[PDB]
Ligand binder design. Structure first.
Ligand SMILES: Cc1ccc(Oc2nc3cc(-c4ccc5c(ccn5C)c4)c(Cl)cc3[nH]2)cc1C(=O)NO
Ligand SMILES: Nc1ncnc2c1ncn2[C@@H]1O[C@H](COP(=O)(O)O)[C@@H](O)[C@H]1O
Ligand SMILES: Nc1ncnc2c1ncn2[C@@H]1O[C@H](COP(=O)(O)O)[C@@H](O)[C@H]1O
Ligand SMILES: Nc1ncnc2c1ncn2[C@@H]1O[C@H](COP(=O)(O)O)[C@@H](O)[C@H]1O
Lengths: 373, 300, 176
């Protein structure tokens, strides 16, 4: 007997991942090839990532894109979970560049358009890959780019930031290797810029055998631009590789760029006074201001739970409505001598409630701010 | 079911809600003068009123409220208006509404446009707030201007009923009798009184001959709060209209032999709430509002 | 249908020959395919109890890391129960995942992300459009509270929330 799952005969190992391997497979009748990712249920229990695996399967299964690897079926067994995906025979984009060297400006653009098309598709669907690199970019027989590993991917939630540092140091954005907070579509653009550079120059923009030196190079955003590079695409690279997240190019900005617009297929992109300030500020010490809040929260007879020293979740019962309104308190650091308390509303899954969710959020904040001010 | 009535029944209010918009909300305990200043600051003509006590939206604050307050408590340019200074939205709502017994008129985002236009007509209001029944959050403020402008784009593609071709005289749309008007020399205070009594959106400004040389709108009243000149009402309507004078095209007018579609295409173009129907000599024969046109299109 | 349920038998260890004998195959010898140190066969099993044993390089043995049953004859076999929650992906993931709000008296603050410093109400828009309309907000900015410095005894709060595909920035004027 052989090893067979869903009529597919499991072949050689294509590669490995943090849990379970990826094996090629072949249909017994048709001979159709698929790539099967075997997830050990006891190993995903060890790491307590079960939520993620459940989450990644939900999202990826809905995904339909030419340049993103499709998930055909997920087969469950008592011991293991089998993810049946599409198989591309070109292997890694990385191995391709190693063997054939850099790509001419025409082919580099063709591939980069396909890759960014996929990165866009994910971001539209509120999914951030954030492992992006030539190792995770595959190729079919016709040299079409395919995004592959979503293991480190995450879901974008409204009003939420991602602290997790994912991916190889070379392809990681300066805010990632610095361990700061990010929204995450701007992290995928940085990586896409490195991939674009890799396609053009056949080398990495930021690389060093000395890790502290490498991290400085990335944060400085300084990289060598070869003389044979079109100054048009250099401007694009300079924009995507911006250290400052706010000055960094968006997908809209790249699509407007003249170097990117050239020979772009139609199918790739679907048709397309008073000074406010955030929260409340204090120059007092982090443990002092944190102490202040807690006293005031109690003064209003609110109940709170401490998730993190600087992160509080506060819930309040409106006397009239008899329901509850939840909000989150997070302390940030604006400057060395300045700190900021942030207010964020929490969506209730409850049945329709009397009053206004938005306003009751304001009133809840108003009481606390009145004390702190 | 008119060709238009079908459309008004099919689409929802959500379809009219812009991608990203701003919504101003007042607490009833807020000082009334500050609320009117806030309307000028944010460039908003009306705001939902929130009672922090009962935790519900009680009503709306419009420019008409600013007109009612001014006309009622105005004494002279020599003495300040204390009530406007002393009162809160809640306090004046008591005085004005004591015998009125008015509720808040709102609509769900999932309700149709036929329901929205009906609600505007039944209650005779120019501001219909859209509230999500689940979150209880006010989403958007619906007006006549947006609804009619919505339809016009859709109307163009489809067959045109003979209704559009008929003139105004034979369609009998608008008010041709007892037009509320002011002279060029008419004091603002007098104009405010006419606003209160007749309850009309605008007053055509006319000469001795009766020809319309200008128009005084409820919207033009808010400029008193903008420049804080509201304390002098003795000035004429002509001197009060000199603030928009830098750009003033003229008074928009339409005739009786004018086709209905021509009029709608005119109002949507200039984005004004009414037209002044006049004879050839500019003498005012009547008014065609946006509420007038909609009421016609919502009926068969 | 439900009578064929894929089940993975995996022997971890070395061998020239590894076989699988069980109640399902009538205790015959089923050769296991091997990749490095793993020997695997995938079988469709009905719902119920199944007992099985391994034949490894001429020695009958069982997996110590798997459930076993001992008979009164002294036979030691591995045992496995085929069940419903194993073969539905989300059912399986739900079993694999296996609170005091009340208040009590009570490392540096994370640096403020630059995204929150984009204020939708501080942004200026064209004079040729409707004053009520606003730019499209970043999803990360939603639900966060923005405010005006208290003046004239009046405090102004604002936040941008999302209704379906539409966004609403709400301003609240409340007195102190
Ligand atoms: C380290 C590690 C240990 C165990 C592990 O769990 C599993 N490995 C497995 C291998 C197989 C498998 C699949 C096809 C095979 C073989 C033989 C021939 N062929 C053709 C083994 C199966 Cl059907 C289930 C598995 N579960 C996963 C990992 C891991 O994290 N990656 O190695
Ligand atoms: N949706 C509404 N619910 C309750 N009262 C309203 C509503 N809209 C307008 N009003 C009131 O109706 C009067 C005139 O409204 P308007 O015609 O919009 O100036 C003012 O007193 C408003 O406060
Ligand atoms: N100056 C005016 N004199 C008399 N009636 C008017 C005047 N302006 C508008 N109307 C009428 O008032 C009603 C509501 O129009 P509006 O106040 O413009 O929404 C309609 O029947 C109009 O014809
Ligand atoms: N028929 C008209 N001719 C000239 N100006 C008008 C006319 N209707 C309204 N306006 C002006 O348009 C502005 C807003 O009017 P509304 O918002 O329709 O009350 C004010 O400056 C009015 O004086």
């Amino acid at each position: 007997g052989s090893v067979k799952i869903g009529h597919y005969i499991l072949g050689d190992t294509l590669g490995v991942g943090t849990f379970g391997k990826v094996k090629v497979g072949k249909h017994e009748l048709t001979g159709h090839k698929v790539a099967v990712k075997i997830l050990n249920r006891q190993k995903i229990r060890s790491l307590d990532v079960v939520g993620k695996i459940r989450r990644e399967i939900q999202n990826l299964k809905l995904f339909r894109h030419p340049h993103i690897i499709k998930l055909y079926q997920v087969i469950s067994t008592p011991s293991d979970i089998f993810m049946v995906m599409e198989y591309v025979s070109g292997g890694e984009l990385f191995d391709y560049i190693c063997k054939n060297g850099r790509l001419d400006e025409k082919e580099s653009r063709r591939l980069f358009q396909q890759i960014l098309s996929g990165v866009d598709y994910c971001h539209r669907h509120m999914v951030v890959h954030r492992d992006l690199k030539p190792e995770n970019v595959l190729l079919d027989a016709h040299m079409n780019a395919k995004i592959a590993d979503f293991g480190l991917s995450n879901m974008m939630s409204d009003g939420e930031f991602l602290r997790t540092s994912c991916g190889s140091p070379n392809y990681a954005a300066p805010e990632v290797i610095s361990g700061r907070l990010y929204a995450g579509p701007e992290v995928d653009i940085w990586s896409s810029g490195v991939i674009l550079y890799a396609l053009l120059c056949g080398t990495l923009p930021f690389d060093d055998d000395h890790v502290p030196t490498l991290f400085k190079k990335i944060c400085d955003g300084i990289f060598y631009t070869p003389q044979y590079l079109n100054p048009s695409v250099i401007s694009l690279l300079k924009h995507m590789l911006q250290v400052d997240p706010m000055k960094r190019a968006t997908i809209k900005d790249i699509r407007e760029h003249e170097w990117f617009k050239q020979d772009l297929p139609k199918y790739l992109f679907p048709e397309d006074k008073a000074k406010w300030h955030l929260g409340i500020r204090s120059q007092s010490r982090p443990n002092d201001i944190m102490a202040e809040v807690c006293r005031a929260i109690k003064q209003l007879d609110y109940e709170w739970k401490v998730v993190n020293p600087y992160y509080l979740r506060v819930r309040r019962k409106n006397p009239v409505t008899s329901t509850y309104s939840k909000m989150s308190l997070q302390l940030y650091q604006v400057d060395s001598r300045t700190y900021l308390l942030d207010f964020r509303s929490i969506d209730d899954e409850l049945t329709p409630r009397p009053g206004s969710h938005t306003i009751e959020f304001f009133e809840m904040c108003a009481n606390l701010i009145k004390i702190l001010a | 079911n008119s060709v238009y009535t079908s459309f008004m029944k099919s689409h929802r209010c959500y379809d009219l809600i812009p991608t990203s918009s701003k919504l101003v909300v007042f607490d009833t305990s807020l000082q009334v003068k500050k609320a009117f200043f806030a309307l000028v600051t944010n460039g908003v003509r009306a705001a939902p009123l929130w009672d922090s006590k009962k935790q519900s939206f009680v009503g709306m604050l419009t420019i008409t409220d600013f007109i009612n307050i001014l006309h009622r408590y105005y004494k002279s340019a020599l003495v300040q208006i204390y009530e406007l200074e002393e009162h809160k939205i809640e306090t004046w709502r008591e005085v004005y509404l004591q015998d009125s017994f008015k509720p808040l008129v709102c609509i769900s985002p999932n309700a149709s446009l036929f329901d929205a236009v009906s609600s505007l007509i039944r209650n005779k209001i120019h501001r219909l707030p859209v509230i999500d029944p689940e979150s209880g959050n006010t989403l958007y403020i619906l007006t006549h201007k947006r609804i009619l402008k919505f339809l016009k784009l859709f109307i163009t593609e489809f067959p045109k009923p003979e209704f559009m071709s008929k003139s105004l005289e034979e369609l009998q749309i608008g008010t041709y009798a007892n037009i509320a008007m002011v002279r060029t020399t008419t004091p603002v205070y007098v104009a405010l009184g006419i606003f209160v009594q007749h309850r009309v959106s605008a007053l055509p400004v006319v000469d001795e001959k009766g020809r319309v040389v200008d128009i005084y709108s409820k919207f033009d009243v808010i400029n008193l709060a903008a420049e804080k000149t509201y304390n002098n009402l003795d000035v004429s309507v002509t001197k009060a209209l000199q603030h928009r004078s830098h750009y003033f095209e003229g008074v928009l007018k339409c005739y009786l032999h004018e086709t209905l579609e021509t009029i709608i295409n005119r109002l949507v173009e200039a984005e004004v709430h009414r037209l002044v129907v006049v004879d050839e000599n500019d003498v005012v024969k009547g008014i065609v509002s946006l509420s007038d046109i909609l009421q016609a299109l919502v009926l068969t | 249908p439900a009578q064929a349920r894929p089940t993975v038998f995996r022997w971890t260890g070395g061998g020239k020959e590894v076989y699988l004998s069980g109640s399902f195959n009538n205790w015959s010898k089923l050769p296991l395919t091997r990749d490095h140190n793993n020997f695997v066969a995938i079988l469709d099993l009905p719902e119920g109890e199944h007992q099985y044993k391994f034949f490894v390089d001429g020695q009958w043995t069982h997996d110590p890391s798997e459930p076993i049953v001992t008979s009164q004859l002294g036979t030691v076999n591995n045992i496995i129960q085929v069940k419903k929650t194993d073969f539905e992906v989300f059912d399986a993931l739900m079993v694999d995942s296996q609170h005091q709000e009340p208040y009590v008296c009570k490392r540096a603050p994370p640096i403020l992300p630059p995204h929150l410093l984009q204020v939708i109400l501080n942004k200026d828009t064209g004079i040729s459009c409707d004053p009520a309309l606003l730019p499209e907000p970043n999803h990360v900015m939603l639900n966060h509270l923005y405010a005006l410095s208290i003046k004239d005894g009046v405090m102004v709060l604002s936040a941008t929330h999302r209704y379906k595909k539409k966004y609403v920035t709400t301003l609240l004027y409340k007195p102190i």
